[PDB]
């Protein structure tokens, strides 16, 4: 949360209109992460209730 709070501080300062920020846990050393991350980055933009 100390890293999480920082990006919130950084966003609430430098954010303009139309601006959307996304923070995620990520490990570039893991091939699984890379595949799973972009599989997340590339799918839908949809929220099913």
């Amino acid at each position: 949360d100390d890293r999480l709070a920082f990006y919130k501080q950084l966003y609430r300062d430098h954010a303009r209109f139309d601006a959307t920020l996304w923070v995620v846990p990520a490990n570039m050393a893991s091939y699984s992460d890379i595949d799973k991350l972009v599989e997340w980055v590339g799918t839908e933009q949809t929220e099913s209730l």
Binding site: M28, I34, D35, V38, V41, G42
Partner: protein, 145 residues
Amino acid sequence: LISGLSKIGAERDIASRLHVVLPGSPNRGMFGGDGAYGEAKSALDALENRWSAEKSWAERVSLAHALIGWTKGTGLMGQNDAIVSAVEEAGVTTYTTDEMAAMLLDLCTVETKVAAAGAPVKVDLTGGLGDIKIDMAELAAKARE
């Protein structure tokens, strides 16, 4: 990672070019004191060849090569901070993080984006550390020592 976003772009069928800024290390071979940056990032010239070889990668990914010069952080470079003034006495420029960030955005401008679409762009963001005659065997080690 480049291949991954290339698949998504091809599968979901976009002609949009992803601009990948390649964080190249400044001026390989003229510094012996870095020990990490200088050697590792010289194969980025070979990576630009892979894009110049592979034909179908053009529409998905554009390679923007940036050589990131001397840039002062507190944590890693806390030893290097004192001699920043010393290296700058050779008529060379060392950069703050905000300065280098600005140099990286300028590559993200519309003008230089289209330039990357036509052909790989190699940018030297270094402060002239290339023609530097400063001996790293001393002025680096001594700085670190």
